[PDB]
């Protein structure tokens, strides 16, 4: 039902790090056409993110043990763990 991939961007002490989050989900706004039903992803455990309908298919998420959760219109939670 869900596919999640996570990777770090070796982190040096003091310097700021980058978190790369990518998930396999076909994001549709609903407006594109027969008409295609709207299905889009709408969080870090420190920072909460809520995207709208205009989101590309298989999107990238940038942030500055890690556990991430992503919720969509239907209800498919995307979880990925990285040291």
């Amino acid at each position: 039902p869900f596919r999640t991939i996570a990777r770090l961007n070796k982190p040096k002490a003091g310097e700021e790090f980058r978190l790369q989050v990518v998930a396999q989900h076909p994001n549709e706004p609903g407006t594109r056409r027969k008409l295609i039903p709207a299905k889009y992803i709408n969080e870090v455990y420190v920072a909460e993110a809520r995207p709208g309908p205009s989101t590309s298919a298989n999107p990238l998420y940038a942030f500055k043990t890690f556990t991430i959760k992503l919720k969509d219109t239907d209800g498919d939670t995307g979880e990925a763990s990285v040291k």
């Binding site: 407006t31 420190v46 920072a47 709208g52 205009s54 590309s56 940038a62 500055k64």
Partner: protein, 121 residues
């Protein structure tokens, strides 16, 4: 340039309350976006500003020409203010960037992303 004051003010009132005239212009907030989008759906969007983590309240992005102006809402409680991301675009749209702070003032950052057709030359 893809400026549309009619559709932008409709989203600013239902989400925040204040319109386009109430927004204060800023130079500190930098919005990194390409001039011409390579794909109709796949469009990169980067936003970052140099200020403490505690001062950051909410980061929002809006599209003028698009039917649905709401792009994304990011609230960093402990994380540094940063969000490259792939978001859909309908046509030649100018993406607006607004940052919320504890002071009350709303910061501005405007950058246009052109959606055009051409040939291999």
């Amino acid at each position: 340039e893809g400026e549309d004051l009619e559709h932008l003010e409709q989203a600013l009132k239902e989400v925040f309350g204040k319109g386009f005239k109430d927004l204060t212009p800023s130079d500190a907030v930098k919005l990194n976006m390409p001039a011409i989008a390579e794909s109709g759906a796949n469009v990169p969007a980067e936003v970052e500003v140099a200020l403490p983590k505690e001062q950051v309240r909410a980061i929002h992005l809006f599209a003028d020409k698009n039917p649905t102006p709401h792009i994304l809402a990011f609230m960093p409680m402990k994380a540094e203010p940063y969000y490259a991301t792939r978001v859909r675009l309908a046509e030649t749209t100018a993406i607006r960037a607004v940052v919320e702070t504890q002071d009350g003032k709303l910061l501005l950052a405007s950058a246009s992303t052109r959606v055009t057709v051409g040939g291999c030359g």
